[PDB]
């Protein structure tokens, strides 16, 4: 499935490539916005 | 006896029992991943009250989420017959957001339209019990209402939202509460002095997975076929007592669509999809001297009597071409539901399916509105010449006419349900297509 | 919380969750072919009117066909309560012919019997809304009715008739319109002055297939396991106030039969399967001075009042051997439906299934009468001594008796629904068995 | 027309119709084993009558058994409105015995609770037609009633009991008939002079298999996943006008459980799960001068008006810990069955499911009470301050209160429907788990 | 009014809850406020007309660690021996005269 | 916040470790001395961690 | 309870007639458990 449409899949592409805190293992900081 | 039937075997039975593949008398049930369900209260941000906006983030208590129920405590501002699905009316809308992306949104009118088309029998009755007062409760009565949500993940375990797989994205529900609810804080346009503000609570039913299943959800990518509601409000061509008004509404919809649905209504009176008249249940005091055909019997707002419906006929055009031959409003109201859903739809509510089974989860034929440059819904209205105050005129009339009070049906709501894909990977997600 | 249940795990769970096979929290949807549905009006040949025979040939606008709905416009010749499913009554019969071969044929009474046994809940109500006037409409009212057909291809897309694969055979629907319809052009035996002739239209839902699927249907052979209705009319061993009438009816049936169904009726009054009586819903004027037990309350012709039914007991014999122990009429009226269908059957209508699930499409056991030299239905009737004009006698009586108006139910309609094979090949098609 | 939609194919259709797997226009039915079904009358030992216990051995008239229907003939001891599911009330209970082992048992109250939760729409109505008088019948009316049983093998062909595989074990049904049936031989506590004893007959539907299928059943071992009913009756903490009574009931349950169900009732009046009141249908004579809130309108014994139900709120505690947040009694009455069953449950009957689909046969989630040493049902009752004889008070009241007559709902019935394994081997069988 | 909480971490620094060691878990306190408070909005069973609704503020005392201690807490696994309170309500077998 | 209400708080990462928690309430007397008894304690009907 | 002579001059096994108002019983138990914290997440060792 999922034929790669370029104009219809732009916000989904922006959400998938958005930066997230994917490097918080054993890192002590005062941030961390309720990460799941 | 039974043995004399078994022996009555011949060539005609080969297609039924020749080379047997299955039996009916021995069932093997499928083993499944161990799980548990817990109903957990969410904290509501903002302020509950009439006309207010509130919201909540779904806590990550379990791994997957399904059923969601919004509870309300309402009081009666008048006697039995003054309210109509007030918990449904109160919850003006609900918006589902993941990671700031709008996934879906439902409206009080949609809940009513949805119900009119897809709930049925005692499912529908029990639903009414959870949103209204149906045992002739009196003024001052207090009741706990439960409004189940109708987002894709609230309908089947099969679409449980993998909250665990969405670490990077919050899942939120935004709820708008109506400024007024009939028979609770207002009686028509009049505020009810002393009316109570609603109490509200949001509950989410969480699925707790076992170790292996939980891990797979957390680590693997997931693709969930989901359904979404598309909706815009429109003004109706003014129905008229002098002619048959008509209207062409551009169907500003997208995505593969399982069905279109719509209703005409009086925006003042929640759930009024038909005209009012002096026949029992069709107006306040209907059937007697005190009848007022401009004020509904709220407790009996809906009806199955099309004579009070305003739509004569309709067709859907795609790029200016007929989709199908023009059919009468009664087709969309009674037959489409018969053919494709199997329930009974109240007058004033219409359905046109593109799907063999629009009520199901599995796709079964769709209209891709993202490929129709200019789709249009063509509507012909009935002539509103019937004297609503005279049962002889109200009940003895013809197919193409309706009540003079049908000209109050100035609002039209056109809805569509489509199929999209919710994709989740590496802790984040959203819908594949816009 | 939910975790407190998951922790409660042990040996008795192994049978349910060990070596798990499935989950409930993720549905796999199956990609399907590309198709679209359109309702297309057919041309009906012959004059439409009461008592006329008309017919239509199904056009080749699409590739496959399923649903068929016959539209009629009828008017009320009297007030509410004077009609009973008049559009169902009007469609006296419909014959399905392919290539000049009779595939099936339904009768107005079959539609009534079918409905009585197989529709239910809101499906049944919505159905009534499409064939009758159910909102207390008055004399002169005009209404468009929709009578869905119930041929094998009209019930599931799975049996869609591949008109595309029938390139050399025409497919026709022959319709017989009733000479009279109660409350529309006749009131009992009296004609209604000024009654209009019905307006008729036949709609067929066409499936448009995309290129790959369409090509396969057009070129490949097909076989379908389909349903047929067998039906004969018989005279009833009319009940007597003096005794228990009895009868042995040879059943001229053939083919693997899913079920038998039957009713006793008053041929004058469509849908009357019970004796008339002076109890609130059992006769014209019941409960008052004007009550008569010679005419029904047509709008309430059907009833669940068993005491007005006339069958005491019955059994089916195969080649002289009882197929089952004799059961009471009430078994066939209330229990068989419970056991096998799940709806509620009105008094006077009886069912005996040979199938585990007769209402479905998958064969689940059949009685092949083509291998049964002598199939006989044995009936015992109730003694008709009850004074129908006296509620004390009508409502306080015993199991084995009925009303003296039971002598009016002189007609017996016995149906058998069976399975045959429809074979389409090289542009031609028809049934494998006679 | 249809073609203008069909042709408008694009990228977003790929996830629905690309590389298609199925169609909808070619159903191929499965071939199956040949079989036939025959209704056989059983011989009932013991005198049938009110209060008697009778039994029957399921005859050896076929290979498998499915449906069982008990026929009764009852005669009205009063007029319409004086009975409530009397054939259901009459059959006090049924015990299923295989090989001398107790496999299962159902009670008249369970049949009522079961129905309240799991039957619906016209199924429920037809059920009522087969167990009560629904055409305003008068005294002396005679009717045959059919009370279908609800044992695991009575619900699906898939669990047909393989009598053929039980060559060395007798299978018996024990039926207890109630000493009294409302509107038939008693009117409340008063006997009805001249009342007839019921006629009774038990029918079993037998499945006749063909040769190959029969042989396999006769020779091979089998394991069936079956559903059993656990049940005990308890005392309801006395509801009262002065306070909110509360109660914690340790639950003597075991095995994987699909759901719990319970009701409060007035043990005098079968099916009364709510308080009596002077509102239409809520008491004998409601709406008039004779209205008396000490006796129900039997023909309308149940109701959907939660105001007459006693339970305020409840939770289930497992091994000392809250399993879920406390929810209103109305949550257990209306929401639970909405979400899990799809029907409507009358006031006074409550459900808590551990299963996604408790109404089905597939074990879609269970609570294993065999691993829960301390399971407790925690109940809080409403304040019984509402004057039942005054509609203004009955109908205009608040969420936390009920009728003064709710104090009469002194009985509590708690049920649990669980899954066990019935094993059959070498001509004998019985259950895999005792506790 | 200042109502101290008495959870294990609210009694000793020894059991300070290391929020930085909980990078994936939130810590929440849910509160139920009484429907009635004696002498504030009710007097026995009688509501007090004109009574004000409460104003609430929750204060949490945090420990700020220097670099080495801070790093170890975020990185290392921990085992805290903590207290829990179990509680159930019962009906009293009320005594009589 | 109000009488009979249910509220909650999430502790934010405003430092590394947490210890004491004090819940402040502002209340007024609805009657004279002798009418209240530890009312802030009563008000805090419960607290769940 | 309304008479100090009866309230204050009584015996070990008796109490006030107003003592029957004390109809609720609260039983508490304080125990130990272990709160484990690892890899950014924590929880109790025993159910």
UniProtKB/Swiss-Prot annotation, chain A:
Cell location: Virion
Coiled-coil positions: none
Induction of its expression: Expressed in the late phase of the viral replicative cycle.
Function: One of the minor capsid proteins that constitute a network internal to the major capsid proteins and outside the lipid membrane. The minor capsid proteins glue and stabilize the capsomers.
Subunit structure and binding partners: Interacts with the major capsid protein.
Record protein name field: Minor capsid protein 3
Protein species of origin: Paramecium bursaria Chlorella virus 1
First-to-last residue of the parent protein present: 22 to 57 of 171
UniProtKB/Swiss-Prot annotation, chain E:
UniProt-annotated location(s): Virion
Stated induction or repression of this protein's expression: Expressed in the late phase of the viral replicative cycle.
Record PTM: Myristoylated at the C-terminus. Glycosylated; highly branched oligosaccharides. The pattern of glycosylation sites are unusual.
Coiled-coil regions, chain positions: none
Domain of life: Viruses
Additional comment: The viral capsid possesses up to five major capsid protein variants. They behave as asymmetric capsid components.
Family affiliation: Belongs to the NCLDV major capsid protein family.
UniProt function note: Major capsid protein self-assembles to form an icosahedral capsid with a pseudo T=169 symmetry, about 190 nm in diameter, and consisting of 1680 major capsid proteins trimers. The capsid consists in 5040 copies of the major capsid protein (hexamers), 60 copies of the penton protein (pentamers) and 1800 minor capsid proteins of different types. The minor capsid proteins form a hexagonal network below the outer capsid shell, stabilizing the capsid by binding neighboring capsomers together.
The protein's name in its UniProt record: Major capsid protein
Organism this protein belongs to: Paramecium bursaria Chlorella virus 1 (PBCV-1)
Lineage, highest ranks first: Viruses, Varidnaviria, Bamfordvirae, Nucleocytoviricota, Megaviricetes
Span covered, complete protein: 147 to 243 of 437
